Structure formats: C-alpha cells, structure tokens
C-alpha cells in the first residue's frame, strides 16, 4: 500500500503471531468442513489408565477447494511488509511498507511439496531458523512453479525436465549455504508417519499419499529418462490428524473421476547432517508442521502495535 521511507525493521518469520493465528484459523475451518466418520484423540493426563476420546458423526462426501484468505490488521495493530526478494526470514529489512491486508493465501494442507503458493520474485530462496541444525526444516521458495497432476486412479504426473531444472536450482542454493565444494544429494524420506513419508495432500475431498522417491533420488555437482515422472499414489481412509495428535477415519471415495492439478511453488526439506568428514550433504523431503506451510507465505509480513 504505502512504502516507508528510510525505515529499517526487524522481521522474524520463525516467531510470527500471524502464523499462529492462521494455524488456529485453518484448524477451525477443517472442523466445520472436512468432518471424519470417526475421530480418536488420546487422553492420558491421569495417573493410571488412558481414556481415548472417540467421536462418531455423520461424514458427508464433500468437495474441498481451498479459497484465498486475506489477513488484514487486527484491532490496535498494523501490518508491515518486507519487500526484499532475497530476505532470509530473520533480520533487518531496509525496504519495508505498510499494507492494509496480506495477499490472498490459500491454506493448502500438505507435506513435502508446497502447492498453489507464491513464487520467489527473483531467484530460488531457501530459509531455515538455523541451517547448522539438521533437525530444523528448510523452507524452499521456487521462482518457477512446476505442475503436478494427480488422479484418484492412483498416480501423480510431473514433467521430468521441469523437475530436473528445479532440483538443479535448489542444489545450487543449498551449496551456496553449505559449501560450494559439497555434493548435493536428494534422497527419499527416512521414515515416520505415512503423511510425512509420502507427499500428502487432499484432492476432491480425498486424502492422497504419493510416493515421492522418484522426485528425491539424485546427486548434484558431483562428477561432470522418461519425459514424465509418474508417482504411485494411494487414497486412504484412516488418516493421522495434522491439527493435533489423533486419528480420523473418512468414508471411501464416491467419485470415479478425481483429477487435480497444482503448481509446486516450494518444498520443505530436512538435511541429514551428522558428523562426517565427507564433502556431501543429503536432503530429504519433510514437513508435517503446517505452521511451516503458513510461514512459507507469511515470512514477509509482521504485525506491530500502532
């Protein structure tokens, strides 16, 4: 809206109440929208036996299509926006403006790949609260989107040439961060819940679990085939909840033509790390904490007292 002349402001995308606010908003949206037939949540607050909370309810088959949310200033506050295209997420921004509201953000709940988001204006950008810490998530922001087309028939398609170029751009940025002499290796998820081991998303109201091994199986800047990458997918009914610890069960699909097409606009990665005298770094798809999803869009905004 209005650019602030000669102003320097500190931003911290990792400690941003806007992220927390959005998180609670999306949890609320999901409660009134995508209702499961059964939900289970543990309760072991007592000293002895546990008491799993079981809810059984009507579970209508509904289409689920994320709609843009605009966050405007909450009473008593203003929204500041960092305009620097290489802003690393934490520190002084010297090109700052006040805005009435954020851009339109689609609250896509997914793991591994960030879909239908905003692209970096200039070069690919990678962000972490602490790059040296292998347990902290690396948020990748692409500057060029890659189509991923999925069907309820059990697969997702990605153009191999486009993905190849994307990985090259990401690996270049990772080298910039971890060392220009380092080999950059992508590998499949090392394990955990099905929702974070696969590329997990919802399409046509259904929960997809796509095996992403083929996307993360390459070695870059080391020595010196199919036009389409086809990822096998499963639609599942018993789902681990992202909103809190628990499980939900949904009814089977009723549509024989479930088709989605999203743009991959970012990734969530983790680095293996560990003690090694080896000039190579291993990166695996990650995610699971949807706050990182919201962060990928809200990193450039901050709310301040007026």
């Amino acid at each position, epitope marked *: 809206e209005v650019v602030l002349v000669n102003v320097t402001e500190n931003f911290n995308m990792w400690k941003n109440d806007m992220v927390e606010q959005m998180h609670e908003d999306i949890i609320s949206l999901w409660d009134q929208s995508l209702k499961p*037939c*059964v939900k*289970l949540t543990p309760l072991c607050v007592g000293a002895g036996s546990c008491n*799993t909370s*079981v809810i*059984t*309810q*009507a*579970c209508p088959k509904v289409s689920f299509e994320p709609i843009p949310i605009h966050y405007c200033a909450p009473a008593g506050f203003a929204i500041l926006k960092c305009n620097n295209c290489t802003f690393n997420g934490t520190g002084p921004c010297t090109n700052v403006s006040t805005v009435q509201c954020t851009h339109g953000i689609r609250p896509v709940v997914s793991s591994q790949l960030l879909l239908n988001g905003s692209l970096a204006e200039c070069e690919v950008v990678i962000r972490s609260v602490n790059f040296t810490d292998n347990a902290k998530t690396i948020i990748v922001q692409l500057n060029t989107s890659v189509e991923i087309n999925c069907t309820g028939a059990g697969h997702c398609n990605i153009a191999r040439a486009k993905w190849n170029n994307t990985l090259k751009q990401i690996a270049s940025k990772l080298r910039e961060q971890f060392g220009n002499n380092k080999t950059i290796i992508f590998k499949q998820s090392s394990g955990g819940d*099905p929702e974070i081991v696969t590329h997990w998303f919802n399409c046509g109201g259904e929960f997809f*679990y796509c095996n992403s091994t083929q996307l993360f199986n390459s070695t870059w800047f080391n020595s010196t085939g199919s036009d389409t990458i086809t990822l096998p997918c*499963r639609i*599942k*009914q*018993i*789902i681990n909840m992202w909103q809190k610890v628990g*499980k939900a*069960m949904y*009814a*089977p699909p009723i549509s024989g033509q479930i088709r989605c097409s999203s743009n991959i606009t970012g990734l969530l990665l983790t680095r293996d790390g560990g003690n090694s005298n080896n000039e190579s770094e291993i990166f695996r798809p990650g995610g699971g904490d949807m706050r990182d999803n919201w962060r990928s869009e809200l990193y450039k905004y901050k709310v301040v007292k007026i």
Partner: antibody, heavy 128, light 110 residues
Framework: EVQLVESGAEVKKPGSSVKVSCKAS????????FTWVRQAPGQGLEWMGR????????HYAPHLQGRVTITADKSTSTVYLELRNLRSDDTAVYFC?????????????????????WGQGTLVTVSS | DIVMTQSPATLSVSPGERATLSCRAS??????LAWYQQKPGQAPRLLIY???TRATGVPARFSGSGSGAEFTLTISSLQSEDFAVYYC???????????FGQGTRLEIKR
C-alpha cells in the same frame, strides 16, 4: 479368509452377565471388522453391534446401548461380546461375523456393513 | 430406525422353477443392501451385497437387483439346496444402526 470359532453354550439367570468369545483364524485380524448378530428361537436376525478392529471402536444397536460391550484382543485374534443385566428375552443364539475391510494397516478401510464370515453360533439361555 | 420389510413371509415354489423375493426399506438405503441364506441350525450365509454383487461361492442363479428402497432377490431355477430362509440387511446409515428384514421362508411346493 477368516474362520470364526465361538465359545460354548451358556446358561444364565436373569440379572446375570455373559461374555462370549469368537476366535478368528486364517487371515490378518486387523484387516477385518467384526459384528455380533443374535437370533431368538423362532425369530429373525438382530444386529447387536460392530467393532472396527483396527481402531478399537465399536458401535451398538440403540436398544442394547449401555449394557452391551464388544471388544477385541489383537494379541489372541479374539473378539468378545459382553451382555449385562441379562433378561429372559436375551435367550438367543449369538453369532460372531466378520468382513474384510481392505489393507487397514495401510489406512485403507471400506467400512463394509455386510457380513461374509460367520461363526457357528453360541446358544445363550437366560432363565430362572 | 430403518425398517426392513420382506415379502412374502412364506414363498412356496416347485423345484426347478424361478423364485422372486422382495425387500423394502422404510427409507432409502441406496445400494447398501445384503441378502443372506439360512438353513435350520446353521449360521446365515452371505449371497448378495451392494444390492447386486454376488459373494464368492454363490452360484449365478442367485441375482440381486434394485436400489433406494426396493430390492429383489431372484433365484432363476431352484435347486434342492436353495430351500431355506432368506434375510435382507440394510447397512446404509452412519453412525451404524444396521437392521434385518424378518425373513422370507422359501419352501417346496408339492
């Protein structure tokens, strides 16, 4: 395919409780849901309830709600039916039945309500 | 409470002839409808589920049709082993409150 073998006949006084069992053999226990159906002498089938074995979640017929409990021991592939505060009109043959639900351990669940596999039945006589 | 009604209560058919059994629901149950066969002293046997799908081991002479609130079980040519009691079962509701019809007894007409 699962084979269901039920426990032996029971004879109870009104006011008592009863617990009958059904051992499931031959397939993966958690890929099945199990249902109890009873049949009073000369009468039809009455659905009592069904357990989603993988979730350990059972649902019951409204007329029985409160005094029936269906449980499953995954370690022994055994399904249990407990009926409390027995009445003479609870006299019936009690059938355990089940149906394959899909690869439940992999999150696939069709939630089938029909019944493919049946036990041999357990006579429960309730009388003074 | 979904009520399942079967007719007739007793059907008498000459051996080798066609038998048609009816099941009606007090409200729509879509295609969530199963048919069972039961002989005296034995457990019920699943014949048809999903209104029209034959279960494994069920001969082709058994045929199920219908949807919504009206269903039919047809046996095209009655064999000696087909005389028994037949039950329909509704399993459409959620939370589940499944219900059975009161049965149609298929007996030999002589």
């Amino acid at each position: 395919e699962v084979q269901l073998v039920e426990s032996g006949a029971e004879v109870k006084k009104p006011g008592s409780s009863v617990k009958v069992s059904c051992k499931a053999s031959g397939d993966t226990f958690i890929r099945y849901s199990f249902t109890w159906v009873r049949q009073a002498p000369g009468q039809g089938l009455e659905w009592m309830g069904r357990i989603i074995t993988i979730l350990d979640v059972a649902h019951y017929a409204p007329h029985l709600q409160g005094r029936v409990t269906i449980t499953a021991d995954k370690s022994t592939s055994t399904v249990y039916l407990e009926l409390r505060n027995l009445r003479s009109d609870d006299t019936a043959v009690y059938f355990c039945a089940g149906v394959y639900e899909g690869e439940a351990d992999e999150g696939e669940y069709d939630n089938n309500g029909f019944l493919k596999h049946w036990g041999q039945g357990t006579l429960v006589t309730v009388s003074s | 409470d979904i009520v399942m009604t079967q007719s007739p209560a007793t059907l008498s058919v000459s051996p080798g002839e066609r038998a048609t059994l009816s099941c009606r629901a007090s409200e729509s149950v879509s295609s969530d409808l199963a048919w069972y066969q039961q002989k005296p002293g034995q457990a019920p046997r699943l014949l048809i589920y999903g209104a029209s799908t034959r279960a494994t081991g069920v001969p082709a002479r058994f045929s199920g049709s219908g949807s919504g609130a009206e269903f039919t079980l047809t046996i095209s040519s009655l064999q000696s082993e087909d005389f028994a009691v037949y039950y329909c079962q509704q399993y459409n509701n959620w939370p589940p409150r499944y219900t059975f019809g009161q049965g149609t007894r298929l007996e030999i007409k002589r």
